[PDB]
Amino acid sequence: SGIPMKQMDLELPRFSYYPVVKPEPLSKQDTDILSNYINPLYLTPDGIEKLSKRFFQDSVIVLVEFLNQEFANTLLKRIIDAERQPTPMHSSEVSFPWKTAIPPHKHRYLYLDHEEFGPDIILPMDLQRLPAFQRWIQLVSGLPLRSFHQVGRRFRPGSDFTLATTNDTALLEATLCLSPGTGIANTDNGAYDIYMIGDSILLSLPAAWNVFSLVYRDEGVLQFVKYVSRQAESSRWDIYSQWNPVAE
Numbered sequence: 001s002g003i004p005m006k007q008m009d010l011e012l013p014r015f016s017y018y019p020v021v022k023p024e025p026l027s028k029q030d031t032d033i034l035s036n037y038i039n040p041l042y043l044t045p046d047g048i049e050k051l052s053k054r055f056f057q058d059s060v061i062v063l064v065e066f067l068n069q070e071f072a073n074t075l076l077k078r079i080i081d082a083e084r085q086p087t088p089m090h091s092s093e094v095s096f097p098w099k100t101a102i103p104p105h106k107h108r109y110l111y112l113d114h115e116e117f118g119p120d121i122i123l124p125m126d127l128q129r130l131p132a133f134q135r136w137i138q139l140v141s142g143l144p145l146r147s148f149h150q151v152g153r154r155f156r157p158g159s160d161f162t163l164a165t166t167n168d169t170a171l172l173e174a175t176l177c178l179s180p181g182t183g184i185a186n187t188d189n190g191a192y193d194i195y196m197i198g199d200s201i202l203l204s205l206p207a208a209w210n211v212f213s214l215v216y217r218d219e220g221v222l223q224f225v226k227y228v229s230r231q232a233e234s235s236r237w238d239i240y241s242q243w244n245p246v247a248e
Contacts, residue, residue: 012102013111017147017244021131023138030132037127039065043136051140059216060203061140066176066212067124076180076209078122083181083234087156097121098154101162109160109225112152123152123178123239141172141214143245150241155191157183158230164196164222171217172243179207181234190226191236197221207236217242 026034031043041047042063055061067075088094088110097118098110116125127133128150138145155161175193184191184207193205195215202221205213217223228236 010103011106012099013113013151015149015151015242016114017149018114018129020138020145020148020243021134023144024135026132026135026139030135033130033132034136036068037071037124037133038068039063040068042066048136048139052142055140055214055216056142061214062205063212063214064208065210067210071124072178072210075122075124075178079178079180079237082122087235089156089159095120107160107162109162110154110156114149114151116152121152123237124176125150125152125239127176128174128239128241137172137174137214137243141216141243143172143243143247145172145243146246148241148243150239152239153237155225155228155236157189157228157232157234159228160225160235161190161227162225164194164224166220166222167217168219170219170245170247172245173215173217173223174241174243175205175213175215176239177205177208177211177213178237178239179235180209181207181232183232184228184234184236185209186232187226189229189232191228191232192226193223194226195221195223207238 034043051061091100094100094110097116098112101107101109101111112121112123112125183189187206191207195203203215
């Protein structure tokens, strides 16, 4: 028993879900578009077919060297530069358009809303909003997807985290990790992505540079990003997206 009633109003971000285009084969234009973002390794006909098979069989795939290297390089320079700057530890110190996830006992991290774009947002928020990508992920995951939302995130060291939460329905989840720090990559300092039940651990994904993880999240599975210790000396940068399967 408890008192008073559970009240969940005090919490940001609040994710709204967006429509996904219908599943179709990739066109020449689709691959032309995606080639400016993603490793050609993962865009060829047989490459995608090989991805489809590993995901069907394992219900998870982790892809090193995900983004096109030339593209990744431009992101790397920007992330290094941001890391050079004073780490914003107060809301008043956070640069537009970043926002702080609240309240502290639920989670803490800096984030970019789904639709966010601009020359100075560092994360590639436009990628997963592309119809071409939405066709790609449905092909790769073998799942027609009804809707989705993405969030660009920065987990500052000695501060940021998410706590374990459950999903009522099954979700397809993707995390594009763009964390180049040496410290963040060491799971002693946390920052790793966990999936577990109710041993319990299903997946443990360390922070990494240019790694794309795709996970079939069964209903009732716990998920969270482990608290980033001071000793990390750098942030975990990623984009986290959840997709609702067409499933009935």
